[PDB]
Design a protein around this nucleic acid. Structure first.
Ligand SMILES: [Mg+2]
Ligand SMILES: [Mg+2]
Ligand SMILES: [Mg+2]
Ligand SMILES: [Mg+2]
Ligand SMILES: [Mg+2]
Ligand SMILES: [Mg+2]
Ligand SMILES: [Mg+2]
Ligand SMILES: [Mg+2]
Ligand SMILES: [Mg+2]
Ligand SMILES: [Mg+2]
Ligand SMILES: [Mg+2]
Ligand SMILES: [Mg+2]
Ligand SMILES: [Mg+2]
Ligand SMILES: [Mg+2]
Ligand SMILES: [Mg+2]
Lengths: 244, 19, 39, 347, 170, 137
RNA sequence: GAAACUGCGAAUGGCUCAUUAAAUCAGUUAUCGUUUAUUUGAUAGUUCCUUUACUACAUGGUAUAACUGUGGUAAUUCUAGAGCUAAUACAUGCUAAUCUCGACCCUUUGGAAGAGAUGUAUUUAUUAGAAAUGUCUUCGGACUCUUUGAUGAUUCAUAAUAACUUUUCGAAUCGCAUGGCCUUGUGCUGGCGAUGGUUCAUUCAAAUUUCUGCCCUAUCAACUUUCGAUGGUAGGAUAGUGGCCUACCAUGGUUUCAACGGGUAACGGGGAAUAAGGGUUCGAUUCCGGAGAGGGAGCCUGAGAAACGGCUACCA
């Protein structure tokens, strides 16, 4: 191709969206945004194929541009806006709040949450670096840059971000015994406690995770998201609690 | 934190017969 | 043409710049206090 | 005049010994035009990097010029500043001249002199009517405006404060660079009466934190025997002022070390006049009293040594013959104990 | 016409590769900018993305740095004396990076005079050959910029082992 | 070290003639990581190399390979030979194959034809060189 | 609200399989080797600096379309002269701040005499980036010292000094609505949005790139190197690494473990058929990637094209 692609065909779309193969020929291509294309759920899919409030497209469009939908507390009007893991979708008119969290099957689940929990989110610290004028900042998994962070925050840690102000309220270090969520692979959606982090210089780091049932599984570090300490998650968990 | 309590369906089936 | 709307826009822009500067300075003071506490 | 070619033209046209430089016969006619042109460029506000660079270029071409012509550029700078009446009368400022406009014209004049001094340094041409009196008159206005003006004109007061700060900096620079070369016998009285004399009363409490331009000014006079007449004026007011900084409780080490180096120099530089004996007695007897507390404040090993270097310097000149001087010297030496061979010889 | 593609070249084994595809824009090249000493002539080049490059067709002045003194001054260019890659560039007085060039000594001399006040003494002591160059009026300098890219003739004066080496080569 | 037209130096490493603190010319060096010890000859040598892992502007990253030196006839580069067994499923049998890899070698290492060299991956040094010697044995 | 200017898109999609035998492609790596429109998140008070002889209650044609009018051609999404007029087009250009200490009073919600400091963008050079186990105290607390982060790894991030630039940016833009202060002035201040703009990160991408894996042919055994083949240094060019090209240097590189050459009704793969298992054949063709638009060659525009329902030459 001579430039960026703009079309996504249904068979080539992510499997977890659960799009009918005979409904059409194309699938909603997620626009550029906070999350990866393959790891994002466009708002059209959420409103139509999951919540069933909309039957089809321009009704999703109309819902959006009445400004009823808020992603992380901000109004969005793009049908293919790439909402992703741990995004808060608020519908004031119906009085609903949702957090995008995969189920054990590995697909985004419709998980209703309270307003108090909807007031915040968690971000995995992808990067920590000094900016211009000697200003430290942290880049999270959703592309949020937060300046002036706590010094104790390092990469692979998890920062609790307040949506209204976009500031860090608390943080969780990456250590053994922490409660952890799998965000990719075949173990995608499972929840466990850290046991060991195997380190390979110049290679991908591997982490061992033990579930509440004492079953153990190993996963790459890029697929790891701390959510709390064992027995005290900082967010409400879907049904099944990431078991099996 | 606990998940939001489930809300019962607001609307229910309504029935009518004629002719 | 010079109209009150243009004056309002210019004044608002100046106010926005000064407010941003003040907010950034307050954040810097807060972080300095935090690191003073840590050290 | 063209902005795009302005830089290349200077290095091309005005460079000394250049193939395309102006011939010696034609310098007289042409260069007055050059000085006026460069003066216009120097007046631009330095609001961007390009604007800052152009100002630097204008001041950097001055060394190419011969000394009489560099004076002409300075004379053009001071032409707008009207100072003849001030020195014509008994050093009194006129109220009408005291305005924001006049301060701004002073501020522009001082800055270029600062830039010219930085470029030419010791080669800077210092002439009376071109530079010094417009400089001395400029600082005179700053004191006059600051004292007379009410608190309402915060804007005017700030500019006077800025002009004073640059004026003192402009002074302390010229004293350092061309001070030994140029003769100040004519202007010693005017410099003291207009600049030093107004502020001697509060010199002490102002300069505790770090060296200042005017404090640096007194130190340079202290180090140089020829300029002790500044220290002699008004019953050693300035020399007493230097000491009353030291006598203060909260004086910091940064200002301490320089003064004792100056005080040590005065001891080590005998001068043949009656006032010198009075000065050294005041400088010495003053230093001895406050020395022990100063040692406690010090935090640098080098700063310890300079007190020893002053203490030894007292010994060779025989001030120790006095019963008071010897006793106070001992009180300080025991404080040091409470370099090593330097202590031993004094004992 | 100019391309940087590696497909046209023979394989490591010596096999003659066949044309995989037509020439592509992202692997392009452009004509050299043989910068020469003379009245400044620079033209911009629109490059990949929104960026721009400056082409020095002619330049007579440049900023040169006295590293030992830690100073930088703008100076006219006298001429190219020695270039390690091509003597033909020296013959044609072509300007490129690493070229050994002669520069006027007036600004550096005047700065030395203002700072040290000598035509303190220990600090004013400088290596002998560069002082001889000051006496001559021209200094040997190495261009550290790339005039065909940034449009500048900026560099640093030779010293020490560098100067001895290039003096031997001269 | 100066057997060439252009003076050969470490870029942006400046020795001050005026200060003259140490007789030795100032040298910059780095450790390439991955537990590869930097030899002292690189630290206290006299060579200059832009493509050296320890004194040049090159970083080792990616695959680390091992091979046997088979040619050292060019300047500053060698050719190693890696052997392996490819599996033919139809005949259910293995067989020997090889490939020759050209690898940059620093003068801090001394290699003859026959030793085992561990090599690290870098940016393309030349037309066919994409590796660099990092440990001789 | 026609027309036109301006902005964006037209580089997506669709079709086909010509050419291509370590090439594409599959799996698997790297960018500490580079560009990246757009999306998302952050991000820029520089007070001052003589001609203030002063536009910021807002600067020009250094200008034109659409439009009026007169015309050329057999003919085309051809256009000439003259006259007008706009910008988020083009080109210019501004308007009493904050922060360190702090004598002295005063002992706090303290006042501040005064010593000090002041954006970005490009280029180069340089620099940084590593027994206080005590005393008092109100029993708390105070007294002296600390002072960059990351990677397995860097000349990394970032900061500092000196200059440099036909050199940038730092809002002369727009919609809705008319709130608050007063010394009552068309005075001061002020709300919700859109569109722009430096840099960083993120996102959609692009380009190279690491290792392993291709049908037949030995009645193809030596091939590549004169006209770059292998490597070294320097330069040029590239968004950038690199013989990609130039100059000079050495004589190198692959191969009976099949190099090189030749054929291929050869795009590759996910897959399809058959088979008990091993195997054999097909795969242009609903999905991923690559190339092309009759055949070669070269380019404008734009973030992105060597584009062809864009342009220029040559052949049929
Ligand atoms: Mg396509
Ligand atoms: Mg890594
Ligand atoms: Mg247009
Ligand atoms: Mg073939
Ligand atoms: Mg757009
Ligand atoms: Mg016209
Ligand atoms: Mg060649
Ligand atoms: Mg074919
Ligand atoms: Mg196929
Ligand atoms: Mg194509
Ligand atoms: Mg056809
Ligand atoms: Mg476009
Ligand atoms: Mg074409
Ligand atoms: Mg067609
Ligand atoms: Mg097309």
């Amino acid at each position: 191709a001579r430039g960026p692609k703009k079309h996504l065909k249904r068979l080539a779309a992510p499997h977890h969206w659960l799009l009918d193969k005979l409904s059409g020929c194309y699938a909603p291509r997620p626009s550029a945004g906070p999350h990866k294309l393959r790891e994002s759920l466009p708002l059209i899919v959420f409103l139509r194929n999951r919540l069933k409030y909309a039957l089809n497209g321009r009704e999703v469009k109309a819902i959006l541009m009445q400004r009823h939908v808020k992603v992380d507390g901000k109004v969005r009007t793009d049908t293919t806006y790439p909402a992703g893991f741990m995004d808060v979708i608020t519908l004031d008119a119906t009085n609903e709040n949702f957090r995008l969290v995969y189920d054990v099957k590995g697909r985004f689940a419709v998980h209703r949450i309270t307003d108090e929990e909807a007031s915040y989110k968690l971000g995995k610290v992808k990067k920590v670096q000094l900016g211009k004028k000697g200003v430290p900042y942290v880049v999270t998994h959703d592309g949020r840059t937060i300046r002036y962070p706590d010094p104790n925050i390092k990469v692979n840690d998890t920062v609790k971000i307040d949506l209204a102000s976009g500031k860090i309220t608390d943080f969780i270090k990456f250590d053994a015994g922490k409660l952890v969520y799998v965000t990719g692979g075949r173990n995608l959606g499972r929840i466990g406690t850290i046991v060991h982090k195997e380190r390979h210089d110049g290679g991908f780091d591997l982490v061992h995770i033990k579930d509440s049932l004492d079953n153990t599984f190993v996963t790459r570090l890029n697929n790891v998201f701390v959510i709390g300490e064992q027995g005290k998650p900082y967010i409400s968990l879907p049904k099944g609690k990431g078991i099996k | 934190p606990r998940a939001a309590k489930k809300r019962r369906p607001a609307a229910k089936g309504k029935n009518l017969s004629f002719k | 043409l010079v109209t009150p709307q243009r004056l309002q826009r210019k004044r608002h822009q100046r106010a926005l710049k000064v407010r941003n500067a003040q907010a950034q300075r307050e954040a810097a003071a807060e972080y300095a206090q935090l690191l003073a506490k840590r050290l | 005049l063209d902005d795009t070619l302005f830089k290349d033209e200077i290095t091309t046209f005005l460079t000394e010994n250049g193939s395309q430089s102006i011939k010696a016969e034609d310098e007289k006619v042409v260069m007055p035009y050059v000085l006026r042109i460069f003066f216009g460029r120097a007046q631009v506000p330095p609001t961007s990097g390009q604007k800052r660079s152009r100002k630097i270029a204008v001041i950097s071409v001055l060394p190419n010029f011969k000394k009489p012509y560099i004076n002409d550029f300075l004379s053009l700078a001071s032409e707008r500043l009207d100072y003849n009446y001030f020195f014509g009368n008994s050093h009194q400022i006129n109220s009408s001249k005291a305005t924001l406009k006049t301060i701004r014209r002073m501020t522009g004049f001082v800055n270029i002199v600062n830039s010219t001094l930085s470029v030419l340094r010791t080669n800077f041409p210092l002439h009376t009517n071109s530079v010094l009196q417009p400089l001395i008159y400029s600082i005179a206005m700053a004191y006059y405006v600051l004292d007379t003006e009410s608190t309402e004109e915060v804007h005017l007061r700030k500019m006077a404060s800025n002009l004073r700060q640059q004026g003192l900096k402009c002074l302390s620079s010229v004293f350092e660079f061309v001070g030994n070369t140029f003769d100040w016998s004519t202007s010693m009285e005017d410099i003291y009466a207009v600049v030093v004399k107004p502020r001697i009363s509060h010199f002490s409490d102002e300069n505790l934190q770090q060296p200042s331009s005017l404090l640096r000014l007194f130190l340079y006079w202290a180090h140089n025997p020829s300029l002790y007449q500044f220290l002699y004026y008004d019953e050693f007011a300035t020399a007493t002022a230097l000491m009353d900084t030291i006598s203060n409780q909260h004086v910091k080490e940064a200002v301490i070390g320089p003064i004792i180096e100056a005080a040590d120099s005065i001891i080590r530089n005998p001068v043949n006049d009656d006032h010198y004996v009075d000065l050294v007695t005041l400088i010495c007897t003053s230093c001895l009293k406050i020395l022990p507390s100063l040692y406690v404040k010090l935090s640098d090993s080098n700063s310890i040594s300079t007190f020893l270097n002053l203490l030894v310097s007292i010994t060779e000149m025989g001030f120790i013959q006095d019963d008071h001087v010897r006793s106070r010297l001992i009180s300080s030496l025991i404080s040091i104990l409470k370099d090593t061979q330097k202590i031993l010889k004094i004992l | 016409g100019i391309s940087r593609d590696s497909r046209h070249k023979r394989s490591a084994t010596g096999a003659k590769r066949a044309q995989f595809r037509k020439k592509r824009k992202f692997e392009l090249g452009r004509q050299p900018a043989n910068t020469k000493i003379g009245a400044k002539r620079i033209h911009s080049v629109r490059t990949r993305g929104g960026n721009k490059k400056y082409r020095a067709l002619r330049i007579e002045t440049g900023n040169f740095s006295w590293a030992s003194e830690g100073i930088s001054k703008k100076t006219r260019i006298a001429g190219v004396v020695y270039h390690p890659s091509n003597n033909e560039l020296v013959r044609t007085n072509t300007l490129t990076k690493a070229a050994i060039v002669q520069i006027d000594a007036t600004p550096f001399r005047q700065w030395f005079e203002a700072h040290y006040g000598q035509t303190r003494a220990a600090s004013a002591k400088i290596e002998s050959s560069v002082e001889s160059q000051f006496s001559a009026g021209r200094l040997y300098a190495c261009i550290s910029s790339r005039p065909g890219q940034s449009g500048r003739c900026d560099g640093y004066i030779l010293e020490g082992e560098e100067l001895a080496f290039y003096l031997r080569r001269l | 070290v100066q057997s060439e037209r252009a003076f050969q130096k470490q870029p942006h490493i400046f020795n001050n003639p005026k200060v003259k603190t140490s007789k030795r010319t100032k040298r910059w060096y780095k450790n390439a990581g991955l537990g590869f010890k930097t030899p002292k000859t690189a630290i206290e040598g006299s060579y200059i190399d832009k493509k050296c892992p320890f004194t040049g502007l090159v970083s080792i990253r990616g695959k680390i390979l091992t091979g046997t030196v088979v040619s050292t006839k060019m300047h500053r580069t060698i050719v190693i030979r890696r052997a392996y067994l490819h599996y033919i499923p139809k005949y259910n049998r293995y067989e020997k194959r090889h490939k020759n890899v050209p690898v940059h070698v620093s003068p801090a290492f001394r290699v003859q034809v026959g030793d085992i060299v561990t090599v690290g991956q870098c940016r393309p040094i030349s037309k066919t060189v994409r590796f660099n010697v990092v440990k001789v044995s």
